[PDB]
Design a protein around this ligand. Sequence first.
Ligand SMILES: FC(F)c1cc(N2CCNCC2)ncc1Cl
Length: 209
Amino acid sequence: EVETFAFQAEIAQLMSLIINTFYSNKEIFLRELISNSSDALDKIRYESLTDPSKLDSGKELHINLIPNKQDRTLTIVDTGIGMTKADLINNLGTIAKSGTKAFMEALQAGADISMIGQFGVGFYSAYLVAEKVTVITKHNDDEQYAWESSAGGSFTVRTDTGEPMGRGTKVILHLKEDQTEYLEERRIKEIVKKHSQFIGYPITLFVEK
Ligand SMILES: FC(F)c1cc(N2CCNCC2)ncc1Cl
């Protein structure tokens, strides 16, 4: 059972701006997704202080970066707090509406796309490099879900039947034909060292066949 939803107009406008604006410094997408992973791990770590049973779905707090040249995908996995169905469909997009307005205003005043994370909508920078994004996610209080969008104004949500994750979020970037540089070990290493060197969780860069 696959459910299709429309993005809110402001979010659709944000994604088309990210896809259509000429902007060469695309590598910032990785810093934004890693920063989102770090916040999600912070949240589960804090909640587990007053409720240790919240870690029964996995004690390890880490970030994995997995390239796959055959599938042309880059996957960012974290064992953070994960997202509920209400998050995927409603809450996160609603939160993002204010940050989207402030971001587009700042852009008209001189800011540039690399500052997108200052407005709380850094996740959508995935579309600087990805033609499609799949998010698999598992929150302690809900089921495992797969969210998916190739932009164009709509996204799908479905119950995920694949490998159970325990808890956390998997962002699968299906890269555009001309952005496969982000599948190379030395390029990812350079980006993580440049933008995410003080993240307080172990970041493991997987290597390929
Ligand atoms: F619903 C989706 F558009 C979506 C949004 C999102 N966020 C945007 C707001 N700030 C960070 C969290 N994270 C994951 C997803 Cl799958």
